């Protein structure tokens, strides 16, 4: 058999990967790049095998020939007799979150406010809200809608990066990796929690996982869910318990991609590696837990219960869904 070379995005992911590689007896080894797009190029060159991706990144990777292999599956809202690996994935809820104290703000008054995004090109943080905004405004100038934003991956001198904070030293402002304080689901929700932005584009789970003591991290440890609201497309505001009826879209779960010629081998190695290090894995928590990273969602989301098999050997457009694909393509016409 061959080793699987994973691609880690930024140095925190690389440290986690190196621990996984040590635990796996080098069944998995690590390449690292500074951004997800750069990891996609490593895998296109054959210098890495796979990484797990948000759906917006699966689009980029899929246009370049990489294929979905396994998808993240989080705990299901309904009881299922099926093993996690065979349970159909449910998709996550993209939402717009604000503070309850910021009383005037609705979907219809977002113009000229301060926004917090997971990163350019990601589903809940970017493709869904900016796709909706370009369509409702009839303008491609989405870079001028919010007065200032943190949208990792954008031009660091531009208003889309003006709220980003970089690392402890203030280096790497706006880089689309975990070194940027406001990157990702947790960083964009911390950008709202600290009142750097007025609105954060994240998913429902983020709000729950980082409030009411579900996170012990310093910036989160004291946040209360009741201090947040969701913005609904009909211009109303709801408590965060109401995400099912107040979301922007349902997103396809993050999933692992690879070259087509290495998909089968990546799939077999991951199914064995989660049996060891996955949730209730043989060797988790004693030795190593593949789906933990102290809330930082490194390599996989921390709420992942398993990687699941895909039904119907789907292409990347079947996995993303025709509608989501079309919405991306419409939005990328602006660029």
């Amino acid at each position: 058999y061959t080793r699987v070379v994973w691609c880690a995005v930024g140095p925190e992911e690389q440290k986690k990967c190196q621990q996984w590689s040590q635990q796996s007896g080098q069944n998995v080894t690590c390449a690292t790049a500074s951004t997800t797009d750069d990891c996609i190029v490593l895998v296109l060159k054959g210098e890495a095998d796979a990484l797990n991706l948000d759906g917006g990144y699966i689009y980029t990777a899929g246009k370049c020939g990489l294929v979905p292999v396994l998808a993240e599956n989080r705990k299901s809202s309904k009881h299922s007799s099926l093993d996690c690996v065979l349970r159909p994935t449910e998709g996550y809820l993209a939402v717009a979150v604000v503070k309850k104290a910021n009383e005037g703000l609705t979907w219809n008054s977002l113009k000229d406010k301060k926004s917090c995004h997971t990163a350019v090109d990601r589903t809940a943080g970017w493709n869904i809200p900016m796709g909706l905004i370009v369509n409702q405004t009839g303008s491609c100038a989405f870079d001028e809608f919010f007065s200032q934003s943190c949208a990792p991956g954008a031009d660091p001198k531009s208003r889309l990066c003006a709220l980003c904070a970089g690392d402890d030293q203030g280096l790497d402002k706006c880089v689309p990796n975990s070194k940027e304080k406001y990157y990702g689901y947790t960083g964009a929700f911390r950008c709202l929690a600290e009142d750097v932005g007025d609105v954060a584009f994240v998913k429902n789970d983020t709000v729950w996982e980082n409030t009411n003591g579900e996170s012990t991290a310093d910036w989160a440890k004291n946040l209360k869910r009741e201090d947040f609201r969701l913005l609904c497309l009909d211009g109303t505001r709801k408590p965060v318990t109401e995400a099912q009826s107040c979301h922007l879209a349902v997103a396809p779960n993050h999933a692992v991609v690879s070259r087509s010629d290495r998909a089968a081998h990546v799939e077999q190695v991951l199914l064995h590696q989660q049996a060891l290090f996955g949730k209730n894995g043989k060797n988790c928590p004693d030795k190593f837990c593949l789906f933990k990273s102290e809330t930082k969602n490194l390599l996989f989301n921390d709420n992942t219960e398993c990687l699941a098999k895909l039904g119907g050997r789907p292409t990347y457009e079947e996995y993303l869904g025709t509608e989501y694909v079309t919405a991306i393509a419409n939005l990328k016409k602006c660029s």
Binding site: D37, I40, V41, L44, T60, K63, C64, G65, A329
Partner: peptide, 6 residues
Amino acid sequence: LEACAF
């Protein structure tokens, strides 16, 4: 309806 970004 278009190609790889890289």
